[PDB]
A paper describes a structure:
Ndc80 is part of a rod-like assembly, the Ndc80 complex, a heterotetramer composed of two coiled-coil heterodimers, joined end-to-end in parallel orientations. The globular domain at the N-terminal end of Ndc80:Nuf2 contacts microtubules; the globular domain at the C-terminal end of Spc24:Spc25 interacts, through two distinct adaptors, with the chromatin-proximal inner kinetochore. We describe experiments here in which we found that a C-terminal segment (CTS) of Stu2 bound specifically at the junction of the Ndc80:Nuf2 and Spc24:Spc25 heterodimers and that conserved features of the four-chain overlap at that junction were important for the interaction.
Clearly defined density in the resulting map corresponded to residues 862–888; there was no density corresponding to the N-terminal seven residues, and the C-terminal residues, 881–888, were part of a crystal-packing contact with the Nuf2 globular head of an Ndc80c symmetry mate. This lattice interaction may account for the somewhat different unit-cell dimensions in our crystals from those of the unliganded Ndc80cdwarf in the same space group, as well as for the nearly full occupancy but slightly higher local thermal parameters, as determined by refinement, for the low affinity peptide, which did not diffuse out during the short soak in cryopreservative. Four conserved hydrophobic-residue side chains in the Stu2 CTS (V865, L869, I873, and M876) fit into hydrophobic pockets lined by conserved residues of Ndc80 and Spc24, and in a conserved polar contact, the side chain of Stu2 R872 inserts between D651 and S654 on Ndc80. As now shown here, the Stu2 CTS adds a fifth helix to the four-helix bundle, without producing any conformational rearrangements, indicating that the role of the junction is simply to anchor Stu2 along the Ndc80c rod, rather than to receive an allosteric signal from it. The immobilized Ndc80cdwarf did not bind any mutant version of the Stu2 C-terminus.
Author numbering:
A (entry chain B): -15 to 69, 76 to 152, 406 to 450
B (entry chain A): 113 to 318, 621 to 684
C (entry chain D): 2 to 31, 138 to 220
D (entry chain E): 861 to 888
E (entry chain C): 5 to 48, 162 to 212
Write the structure that this text describes.
């Protein structure tokens, strides 16, 4: 408690609207519901209304890695590897600017042309909801046309299914034979001990 | 806490003036903005021209940044976000008129920005190349000589990632067209169909490989089992022969010695 | 104990199987042989008060009995011998104390008779 | 076809069992 | 099938037919019989021993010791008449 979005909810004079972006600006609660339903569990009304850096950095990294299917970390790594087989003056600045560029390129693709360091390192509420609103519109676009690609997914799952069923067959045959081998091995061990026991008793009465 | 660079050194100032001038002239600074650049200007500048240079450099680092109405009030915050290593050595009051006695701190700041710009371009180039490289990792790994499931089971997730990257390509491009009021995505769909055919081919190789391995394990198990049974036959054959043979030895000895004992006890005179 | 290692136990079996043959090597009688060689048997006497009877030859041609259970050392004899031969034989078992001397003399008297 | 080695081996087993269960003296 | 219907039982049956006590008991009786032969041969064997006729079956000969020396000639057991032949040597070399 003791947190007041109650007077933040006083959105006076909101009836007329203006929006120069092509995508719609979403109200905070719907924005968070959509972000959570996209499996960004970390997104909440409280954090997004008062955005802090390191929260937006984390959240943006999660969004970009999901929608682009790449590792941000791997990109920073290749950013620092040098040709050969006093530079800490620049490393922190370069890492921060490389992450900025990755976000910049990503948002250009979804109707935001001016992502910049402020959005990562001193986030502000309206820009944050604007950027995240662009993310949701892209996700909704993907969901609607995902039936265009259902045949590919189903073919892929069938083919992966055939691999798995065949590999199950392989392990079943190879497991069953191992059972056959041991039951013979168990019984042979009994007989081996029996013959050794026999000789040991017979030696008592020899020599 | 203090700037380790020898900012007061006049040779150092002469050097970094050249390096700042060279980069700005080479990259069309005096053309993109009408302000000309010269060694003399960096020797002692105007406040208006300094802000032009700072804004021009920072936009090369952060092109989407929206400069405020009075750039002097955000230079400190920009450097804080940039994580300028010599931030503490610069006081916010002197940014208002940099051409004064403290100009050396801002000449050094400009040179650091030039060096950051130079290094950032190389970083982004390596990032670009990494993206191209990462687009092929899966088909390259999945088309390596195939190993048994005991050492590659995450193969399935590699296949799924490859198909997911194809869909990511499709919807990323389609969405660009969608925001341009375009509705035909057949180019992207044809591109997705072609890439997906690559996927089908490579996994088809895994199906055939696995099928051949399965039919061959059947033969191998049949041979191993037959050999094992023959081993069991051998154990039973000579264990039984062993026991019966000694049983014969025991039986013969006992009748032998019984006949001896009869002779020892046969006291008939006859 | 792996069945692939059965050849190790097979080797032990072949060895023990022949250790049995050694232990059960056909022990000779040692008495049937001596009787076969010497044509001499030691049997209880017909009058078991006089215990030991010594028999010579393949058939019942020669035998003599000895007691040392009373005053009569010399038992009877299937070919009868005179008293003088019987007194000499009774002293050989008492004043000479030699079985071998008693044995060679008795059979010579008996075999010639 | 002629895998009657099993009968040959089972004949030995049955002989051994018959020797173990045998009772020497028998009358009527 | 050239296989085994049940190799586990097959082996089990052989072990269960591998009568240990029977053969051990046989060994006890054999050892007993040896004691009987030894004890019931002893008294006769010493009487034959006092004759001087000592016997080597380790080396296929028979010794005679009725001349107060170990130089009395031996007799092999092979390729001989024994028709008043072996007995004659082992009565004419004897005091």
């Amino acid at each position: 408690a003791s947190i007041f979005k109650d007077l933040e909810a006083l959105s006076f004079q909101s009836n007329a609207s203006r929006n120069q972006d092509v995508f719609p600006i979403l109200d905070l609660q719907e924005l968070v519901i959509c972000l959570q339903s996209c499996d960004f569990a970390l997104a909440t009304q409280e954090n997004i209304s008062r955005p802090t850096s390191d929260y937006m950095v984390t959240l943006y990294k999660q969004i970009i890695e999901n929608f682009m299917g790449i590792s941000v970390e791997s990109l920073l790594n290749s950013s620092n590897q040098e040709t050969g087989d006093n530079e800490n003056i620049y490393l922190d600045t370069l890492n921060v600017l490389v992450l900025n560029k990755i976000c910049f390129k990503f948002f250009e693709n979804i109707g935001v042309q001016d992502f910049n360091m402020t959005d990562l390192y001193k986030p502000e509420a309206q820009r944050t909801q604007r950027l995240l609103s662009a993310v949701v519109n892209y996700a909704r676009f993907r969901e609607e046309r995902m039936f265009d690609c259902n045949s590919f997914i189903l073919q892929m799952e069938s083919l992966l299914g055939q691999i798995n069923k065949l590999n199950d067959e392989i392990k079943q045959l190879q497991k069953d034979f191992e059972v056959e081998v041991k039951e013979i091995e168990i019984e042979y061990s009994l007989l081996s001990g029996h013959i050794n026991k026999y000789m040991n008793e017979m030696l008592e009465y020899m020599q | 806490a203090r700037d380790p660079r020898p900012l007061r050194d006049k040779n150092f100032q002469s050097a970094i003036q050249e390096e700042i001038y060279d980069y700005l002239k080479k990259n069309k600074f005096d053309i993109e903005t009408n302000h000309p650049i010269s060694i003399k200007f960096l020797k002692q500048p105007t406040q208006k021209g300094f802000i032009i240079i700072f804004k021009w450099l920072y936009l090369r680092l952060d092109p989407g940044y929206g400069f405020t109405k009075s750039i002097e009030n955000e230079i400190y915050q920009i450097l804080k976000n940039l994580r300028y290593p010599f931030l503490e050595s610069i006081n916010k009051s002197q940014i208002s008129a940099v051409g004064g006695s403290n100009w050396h701190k801002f000449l050094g700041m400009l040179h650091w920005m030039v060096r950051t710009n130079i290094k950032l371009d190389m970083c982004l180039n390596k990032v670009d190349r990494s993206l191209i490289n990462q687009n092929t990792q899966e088909i390259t790994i999945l088309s390596q000589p195939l190993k048994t499931l005991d050492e590659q089971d995450q193969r399935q997730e590699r296949y799924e990632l490859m198909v997911e990257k194809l869909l990511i390509d499709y919807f990323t491009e389609s969405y660009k067209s969608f925001l341009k009021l375009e509705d035909n995505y057949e180019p992207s769909m044809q591109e997705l169909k072609l890439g997906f055919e690559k996927f089908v081919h490579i996994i088809n190789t895994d199906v055939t490989s696995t099928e051949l391995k399965l039919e061959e394990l059947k033969v191998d198990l049949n041979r191993k089992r037959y050999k094992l049974h023959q081993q069991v036959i051998h154990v039973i054959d000579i264990t039984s022969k062993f026991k019966i043979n000694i049983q014969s030895s025991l039986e013969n000895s006992e009748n032998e010695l019984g006949n001896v004992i009869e002779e020892l006890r046969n006291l008939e005179f006859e | 104990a792996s069945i692939d290692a059965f050849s190790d136990l097979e080797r032990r079996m072949d060895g023990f199987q022949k250790d049995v043959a050694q232990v059960l090597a056909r022990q000779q009688n040692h008495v049937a042989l001596y009787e076969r060689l010497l044509q001499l048997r030691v049997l209880p006497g017909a009058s078991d008060v006089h215990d030991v009877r010594f028999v010579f030859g393949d058939d019942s041609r020669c035998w003599i009995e000895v007691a040392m259970h009373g005053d009569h050392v010399i038992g009877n004899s299937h070919p009868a011998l005179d008293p003088k031969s019987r007194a000499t034989l009774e002293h050989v078992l008492t004043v000479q104390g030699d079985l071998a001397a008693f044995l060679v003399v008795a059979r010579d008297m008996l075999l010639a008779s | 076809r002629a895998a009657a080695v099993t009968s040959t081996l089972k004949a030995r087993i049955e002989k051994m069992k018959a020797k173990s269960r045998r009772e020497g003296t028998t009358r009527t | 099938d050239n296989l085994l219907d049940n190799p586990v039982e097959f082996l089990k049956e052989v072990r269960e037919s591998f009568d240990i006590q029977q053969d051990v008991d046989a060994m006890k009786r054999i050892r007993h019989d040896l004691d009987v032969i030894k004890e019931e041969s002893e008294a006769r064997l010493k009487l034959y021993r006092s004759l001087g006729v000592i016997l080597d079956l380790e080396n296929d000969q028979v010794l005679i010791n009725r001349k107060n020396d170990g130089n009395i000639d031996i007799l092999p057991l092979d390729n001989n008449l024994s028709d008043f032949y072996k007995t004659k040597y082992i009565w004419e070399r004897l005091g």
